[PDB]
């Protein structure tokens, strides 16, 4: 008789907050200290990278973890263990593709706050990870490689899970993302405070031996720097290890009058809260008494 709603879960909002902070934190410079008792003026700055983080309840509270096989994410849950913290999550900032995440226990699983509502995003959780390698231009044009027949394979597997969900008498098609912000249109993502943007046209044009995605690299570029340029260039950014595991997707479905048995899907769904959401779906915080 226990309720879970992954789509209204302040843990998501909360995590997002923290990630944001982690980012601002990573931009502010050190404030000079005062007093005769200061060891050094050198302050520690943690670089903007995926940090292992658990979320935890205070005393008098607790976290419920749903353990139902292929859990809906919303509604009742039967095998619900109660715990003090979540598993450790090393969250990755990205769009379109969920990276380095948890894999679906058995087979491909998809989730949406509603499926009839095409407005609501669909989160795909893969049961089998797909590798993807990306490199900083030796500083050789920034790009990413991917096992083709493996990816095509995945899309097919997904299509199936959608036919199941929308009546398998329908034809599934993937289109690239339409208009929007650059980050939303491309598959973008963090890599140590530098952000890749990747033309994923080749990733989302599927129907009825490796792939290469071209990428740009927007850099930090401020702030808090004006009238302060006396030193040299960056420290560890020659050929950054960005390669990772694709463990999910964010999708949205089209809704026009003239679409028949035929359904179109595209690459980027909602905001990044949805990323966190994909890891926190099986948890909930709640009070004791």
């Amino acid at each position, epitope marked *: 008789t226990e309720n879970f709603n992954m789509w209204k879960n302040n843990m998501v909002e909360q995590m997002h907050e923290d990630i944001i902070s982690l*980012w601002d934190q990573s931009l502010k410079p050190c404030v000079k200290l005062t007093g005769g008792s200061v060891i050094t003026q050198a302050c520690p700055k943690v670089s903007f990278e995926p940090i292992p983080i658990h979320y935890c309840a205070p005393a008098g509270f607790a976290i419920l973890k749903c353990n139902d096989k292929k859990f809906n994410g919303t509604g009742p849950c039967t095998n619900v263990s109660t715990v003090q913290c979540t598993h450790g999550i090393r969250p990755v*900032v990205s*769009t379109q593709l969920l990276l380095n995440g948890s894999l679906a226990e058995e087979e491909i699983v998809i989730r949406s706050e509603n499926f009839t509502n095409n407005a609501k995003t669909i989160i795909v959780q893969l049961n089998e990870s797909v590798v993807i390698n990306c490199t900083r231009p030796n500083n050789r044009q920034a790009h990413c490689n991917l096992s083709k027949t493996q990816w095509e394979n995945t899309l097919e597997q997904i299509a199936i899970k959608l036919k199941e969900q929308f009546g398998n008498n329908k034809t599934i098609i993937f289109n690239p993302s*339409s*208009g*929007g912000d650059p*980050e939303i249109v491309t598959h973008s993502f963090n890599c140590g405070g530098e952000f890749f943007y990747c033309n994923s046209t080749q990733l989302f044009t599927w129907n009825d031996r490796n792939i290469t995605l071209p990428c740009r690299i927007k850099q930090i570029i*401020n702030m808090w720097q004006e009238v302060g340029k006396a030193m040299y260039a960056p420290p560890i950014r020659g050929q950054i290890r960005c390669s990772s595991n694709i463990t999910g997707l964010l999708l949205t479905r089209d*809704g026009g009058k003239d679409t028949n048995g035929t359904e179109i899907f595209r690459p980027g769904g*909602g905001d990044m809260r949805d990323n966190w959401r994909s890891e926190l779906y099986k948890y909930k915080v709640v009070k004791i008494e």
Partner: antibody
Amino acid sequence: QVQLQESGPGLVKPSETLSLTCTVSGGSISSHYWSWIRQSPGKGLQWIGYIYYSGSTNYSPSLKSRVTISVETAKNQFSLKLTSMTAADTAVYYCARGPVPAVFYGDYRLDPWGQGTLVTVSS
Amino acid sequence: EIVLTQSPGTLSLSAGERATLSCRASQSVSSRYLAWYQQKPGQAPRLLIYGASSRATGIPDRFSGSGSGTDFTLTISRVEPEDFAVYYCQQYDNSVCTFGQGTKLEIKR
């Protein structure tokens, strides 16, 4: 490309309220922020407020009391509501995407705009 | 809340000349949040420069942005006949988005 299209009554009687609708095509309201801006004849630009596709809003302080911005992602449009219209409210009203970027590391700016609608307050 | 004051109310020159429009904030402002827009008569404004010095896509490179802190500058290297427009600097801070009152650019011929 992404195109916005306002629409609504050219004329509004004094004290009554204003309703407008911007319609997006080429892109999707999802993931994005959406603003209304107005400009009086010969005057300058005034930001009215925005709404996140999520539904959370943020209004300009000097207008807060009279403004409502709704969204209907299902039909891919957002709307304005302005209370107690007076001659001082006669203006061209624009919808525009932004000013906040979809993601935190995006860019801050108002883009694609609408064409604007001229609303006249008169009996 | 911040107040943006633009450079000259009206600015008038011939084609080929260089135009300098400034924007001065009542307070200090991060460059990420400053933008410029060009409004030709009868039209909606068009994004010209975002993030102080970043050129919007499609915009002719004879436009450039500069400055930081309190003083910012839009610069047109070689004025054209159809660069005739009103020009607004804008910023977003503290949950509020304000504009300068604009600079009317007139062409001499």
